[PDB]
Design an enzyme around this catalytic site. Structure first.
Site, PDB file in Angstrom:
ATOM      1  N   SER A 145      13.933   5.401  -9.069  1.00  0.00           N
ATOM      2  CA  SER A 145      13.431   4.545  -7.963  1.00  0.00           C
ATOM      3  C   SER A 145      12.815   5.446  -6.896  1.00  0.00           C
ATOM      4  CB  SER A 145      14.528   3.625  -7.448  1.00  0.00           C
ATOM      5  OG  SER A 145      15.041   2.800  -8.457  1.00  0.00           O
ATOM      6  N   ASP A 252       8.359  -3.827 -13.637  1.00  0.00           N
ATOM      7  CA  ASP A 252       9.441  -3.305 -12.803  1.00  0.00           C
ATOM      8  C   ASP A 252       9.855  -4.326 -11.736  1.00  0.00           C
ATOM      9  OD1 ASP A 252      10.753  -0.363 -12.074  1.00  0.00           O
ATOM     10  OD2 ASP A 252      10.405  -1.595 -10.288  1.00  0.00           O
ATOM     11  N   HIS A 301      14.905  -2.206 -13.901  1.00  0.00           N
ATOM     12  CA  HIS A 301      14.733  -1.262 -12.789  1.00  0.00           C
ATOM     13  C   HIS A 301      15.690  -0.090 -12.970  1.00  0.00           C
ATOM     14  CE1 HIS A 301      13.703   0.123  -8.806  1.00  0.00           C
ATOM     15  NE2 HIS A 301      14.957   0.040  -8.396  1.00  0.00           N
TER      16      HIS A 301
HETATM   17  C1  LIG Z   1      13.137   1.646  -4.530  1.00  0.00           C
HETATM   18  O1  LIG Z   1      12.185   1.475  -3.549  1.00  0.00           O
HETATM   19  C2  LIG Z   1      11.038   2.251  -3.729  1.00  0.00           C
HETATM   20  C3  LIG Z   1       9.783   2.004  -3.052  1.00  0.00           C
HETATM   21  C4  LIG Z   1       8.709   2.896  -3.354  1.00  0.00           C
HETATM   22  C5  LIG Z   1       7.392   2.890  -2.868  1.00  0.00           C
HETATM   23  C6  LIG Z   1       6.891   1.947  -2.003  1.00  0.00           C
HETATM   24  C7  LIG Z   1       5.570   2.058  -1.621  1.00  0.00           C
HETATM   25  C8  LIG Z   1       4.765   3.075  -2.101  1.00  0.00           C
HETATM   26  C9  LIG Z   1       5.274   4.014  -2.980  1.00  0.00           C
HETATM   27  C10 LIG Z   1       6.584   3.908  -3.352  1.00  0.00           C
HETATM   28  N1  LIG Z   1       8.887   3.883  -4.215  1.00  0.00           N
HETATM   29  C11 LIG Z   1      10.065   4.088  -4.824  1.00  0.00           C
HETATM   30  N2  LIG Z   1      10.110   5.211  -5.773  1.00  0.00           N
HETATM   31  N3  LIG Z   1      11.125   3.272  -4.592  1.00  0.00           N
END
Ligand SMILES: COc1cc(-c2ccccc2)nc(N)n1
Ligand SMILES: *[C@@H]1O[C@H](CO)[C@@H](O)[C@H](O)[C@H]1NC(C)=O
Length: 355
Positions: A145, A252, A301
């Site tokens: 995540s 996802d 997820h």
């Molecule tokens: C688990 O919540 C998240 C949100 C985001 C995210 C949100 C906007 C742009 C880029 C990434 N990214 C990850 N890896 N996790």
């Protein structure tokens, strides 16, 4: 069980000024090291960081951490649960900086919170070199995540740190799980409070709030004020020099969340059906030139630290096998594939999906 070590450099802190740290289990006969980044969203201003401190405090502070933690999935030491890397040295780095592992800002008289995720990774690597990391052959930086996105944002910096400290023989690699998002149009749309704020706008504000840092080559392409682009995998990945394996569900749950899609009451009409089919096609397209990847057609997820991560298969190949084949390719392999992306167009058209 992995056991807690709080960082000896107490200036490197979680959100509330308490020391950050890591959980470690050594494997004396091994020269492979696995450093895993926890995920868990983020916060981007005073008001929504205060809300997170009330009800998600272990993601903002170490004062309540337990002294041990059980290794699961790819962090397991039992060959039955972990066919891939069961004999490796195992490290779990808790996420207590709420900044997608990007920040470099201390708590001060003008900053209520510290955002030091990028510096937390660097300091964990420093202190591990005195516990055995100095003798490693492969350092795999993994994450799920927000920690998956953090791999993309930090893997090349870890490689540069080890080169400048005088350890050029250690091979740094990345494993990004469920951190490969799209800045696409939402299914229904609003104006930027916390939830109505599209990720692109929330990340742009986050970056100023955290003093976020992004990989150098990507920063040079997009330039001042546009660094938020480097948080999106298909934009930052082409700029990276370290080998990175990408694991991404095509449907996802976090991507659908930011897209304002809620699958409930089960009667999907034509507009939503085309939206979901188009999202799967778009994600497949961004992965076509990623030579090491695993992308099943499932609604889920995270996967790599879950106990039943051995069950899902693409074209007959499991995730732990795909990662072993990747290890062999870094020494095309007959019957040992490394690029595995489902082609069927609806969630659960793969029979091995998580239930
Ligand atoms: C688990 O919540 C998240 C949100 C985001 C995210 C949100 C906007 C742009 C880029 C990434 N990214 C990850 N890896 N996790
Ligand atoms: C402690 O961490 C801070 C912040 O990254 C850094 O400026 C300082 O050099 C570190 N001190 C030591 C002894 O590593």
């Amino acid at each position: 069980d992995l056991r807690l070590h709080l960082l000896l450099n107490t200036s490197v802190t979680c959100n509330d000024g308490s020391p950050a740290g890591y959980y470690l289990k050594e494997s004396r006969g091994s020269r492979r090291w696995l450093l895993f980044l926890e995920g868990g969203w983020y916060c981007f201003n005073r008001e929504n960081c205060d809300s997170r401190y009330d009800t998600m405090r272990r993601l903002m502070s170490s004062r309540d951490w337990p002294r041990t933690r059980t290794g699961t999935g790819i962090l397991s030491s039992q060959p039955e649960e972990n066919p891939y890397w069961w004999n490796a040295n195992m490290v779990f780095i808790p996420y207590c900086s709420s900044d997608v592992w990007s920040g470099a800002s201390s708590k001060s008289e003008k900053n209520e919170y510290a955002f030091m995720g990028a510096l937390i990774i660097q300091e964990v690597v420093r202190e591990l070199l005195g516990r055995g990391l100095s003798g490693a052959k492969v350092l795999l930086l993994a994450g799920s995540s927000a920690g998956g996105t953090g791999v993309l944002l930090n893997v090349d910096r870890v490689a540069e740190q080890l080169e400048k400290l005088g350890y050029p023989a250690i091979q740094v690699r990345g494993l990004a799980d469920s951190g490969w998002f799209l800045d696409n149009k939402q299914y229904r749309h609003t104006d930027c409070d916390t939830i109505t704020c599209a990720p692109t706008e929330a990340i742009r504000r986050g970056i100023r709030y955290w003093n976020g840092v992004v990989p150098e080559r990507c920063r040079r392409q997009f330039q001042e004020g546009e660094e938020w682009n480097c948080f999106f995998g298909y934009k930052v990945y082409p700029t990276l020099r370290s080998p990175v394996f990408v694991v991404q569900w095509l449907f996802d749950e976090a991507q659908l969340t930011v897209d304002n899609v809620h699958l409930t009451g089960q009667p999907v009409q034509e507009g939503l059906r085309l939206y979901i089919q188009n999202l799967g096609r778009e994600l497949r397209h961004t992965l076509k030139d990623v030579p090491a990847s695993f992308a099943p057609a499932c609604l889920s997820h995270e996967i790599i630290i879950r106990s039943h991560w051995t069950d899902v298969q693409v074209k007959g190949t499991s995730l732990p096998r795909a990662l072993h084949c990747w290890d062999r390719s870094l020494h095309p392999l007959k019957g040992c594939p490394v690029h595995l992306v489902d082609s069927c167009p609806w969630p659960h058209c793969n029979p091995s999906c998580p239930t």
